[PDB]
Structure formats: structure tokens, C-alpha cells
Amino acid sequence: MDWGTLQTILGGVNKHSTSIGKIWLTVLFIFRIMILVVAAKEVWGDEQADFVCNTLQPGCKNVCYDHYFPISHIRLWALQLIFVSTPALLVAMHVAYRRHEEGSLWWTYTSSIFFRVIFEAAFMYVFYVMYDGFSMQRLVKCNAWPCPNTVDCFVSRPTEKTVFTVFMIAVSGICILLNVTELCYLLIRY
């Protein structure tokens, strides 16, 4: 995809936030989006076109690809970004509700931060359990029907996909830490 105007939306959402919340989470957020669109989205461009299986059985390539990649990484990251951005924007709408006509504003703001840490941890769990670590393999062995006994299939761009996987996981771990420290920073204020 592409974009036409993201500076206006970031400027408005910038206001009414804490020191680190104003900058650090925001710059890390646009950091992840930039990585996703300009670079990574076309590494996974031919994930199925260049999948190769050493067999003559028709339909074996379809099932073996689907058995090992139930959902591709880039569409896992796209889902994650949407989930961890909605609490940011709806609170911008809840205040717009009260504008048309302090505990409430405080209660909402502290609640959103509790959600963001939840979603990121949940999604990082899915990568680990689904893909068995963060390293992708050149060779996969598949024996689902209709494939005969056991078939060798070869992945496209295994090394580059590993690099971006490590990169997206790292900045997600940072965002979790930033949320936790900022959260406990408010708790002492009570």
C-alpha cells in the first residue's frame, strides 16, 4: 500500500500524553509501520510462488505450504498493529464525546495502557508456539495427504525472513518494557 497524510493524525494524537509516552512509544510505533510497509511486505511477496516441493503428485505443494504456514508473518504483524492502535484512537474519541456537551479521564487512560501490554504479549506468544522459535528453516518435511510417504519442500528467502522476524520481535519487547515502566510511574502517583 501507500499513504497520503499521516502527519496530521500523529500531531493531534501527540497531545495529552506523558513525557516518554509522548515520544518513545510514538516513534517506536511509526518505526514498526515503516519497517512493515516499505521493506518487509515485499520480502513475503512470493512466499507461495517460489515454494518448491520435490514430487510429482498434484496438490502436494498446496497442502504442504498450508500445513507449515497457517498464517503468514506479515499478516500477523498487521493484525497486531491494528489491535495495539485502537485504544490509542478511541480515547481520542471518548474525550471528543465529553467535549460536545478527573477520575474518568484518569481511569480510561490507565486502562488503555493495561490493554496494550496484554495484546503485545499475546501476539508474541503466538509466534513462539505457532512457528517454534524465531528462526526459519530452509527445508521442511511434509507427509499430509495427498502427498506420498514424505516429501522435501524448500522455503523461499529463509535468511531474510529471519532477520526481519528478529527485528520486529525486538522492538515489540521494548514497547512492552516502556509500557510497564510508564505504568508503574503513574502508580506511585496513585
Add this chain to the structure above:
Amino acid sequence: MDWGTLQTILGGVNKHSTSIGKIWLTVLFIFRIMILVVAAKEVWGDEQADFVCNTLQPGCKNVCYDHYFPISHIRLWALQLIFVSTPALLVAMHVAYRRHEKKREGSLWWTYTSSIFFRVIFEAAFMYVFYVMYDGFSMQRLVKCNAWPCPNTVDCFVSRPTEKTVFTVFMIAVSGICILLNVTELCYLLIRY
């Protein structure tokens, strides 16, 4: 082609509506659009390029694909969003000139309950069509096809059945929620009689 000056379009439309309808319906509504355009629309990119049938007959692939997918999933969701969007739009437009003229009321409650009423119809109808026409929300790896010109019976294999199931389940769930949100409006709206 991609998103344009929707922020002003949405900025205009959110004003002058009920509290949860102010945000929750709209937020869930842009929730569906993002999934449709950002992620889902390229899962279905090679639906027919990667259909594979175990046969040597010319034209068996065309008839078998057309028989099991009379209309693609992403085209139904696009249609559904258009239909549910319109009643929100026009009624939001209808109030504009009066607010314009007032600076220069039981009727609208008939209109407002009408638009709320219509949305639930379109949500229910489209969720109904998925069930009857695709035989549940789960997509299978293997389809057996015996339409002419195919010989006796042919095995054909779908592309990305597991990923298409995940998004199908997701779109149905958020569609089900919007129905629940809508009916709450009428209960708050009818309780005043």
C-alpha cells in the same frame, strides 16, 4: 487506488449521534475496513491462479472453480460494508441543513429508528448468505467436482484454506457484535416510547 480524504468524511459523520453509536459502531466499522484492505485482500490474491485439479481435461478447472466459489468472499464483504454504510450516511446528511438553517422534532426519531432498523437487516442477510452458500464457516482443502466437461469425478485443491478460515471467523465475529450493539439502541430508544 487507496484511501483519501476520509478523515473529513468521518469527521463530519461522527457528530450528532448516540453515545455508543457515536464511537463503538464507527470504531468497529473502521475496524472491519482495515482488515479488509490492509490484510485480507491479498490472501485471496491467487484464488484461481493456485487452484489445482488432478486431470488432463481442458476446461475442467474453470467449471470446477466456478461451481464451488460462485462469488468470492472478499467481494461479499465489500458489498456488505457498502450496504450497511449507506443508511448511516444519508441520515447523517439529512440533519445538516436544519442545523445550518437553525442558526440563520419527533419526525427524525422515525428516521433514526429506521436506519438502525435497516442495518440489522443487512447484517443478518449477509451473515445468512455465508452460511447457506458456503456450508459453514470452515473451508476445506479438498473439493470433489463432477460437473461437465469433467470426467467421472475430479479432485481439486484449494489455496490457503487455513488462512482464509481465520479471516472468515474474524469477520463473522465482529459482524455479530455490531448486531448486538445495534439492538441496544432500539431498546434505549423504544423505552422512551
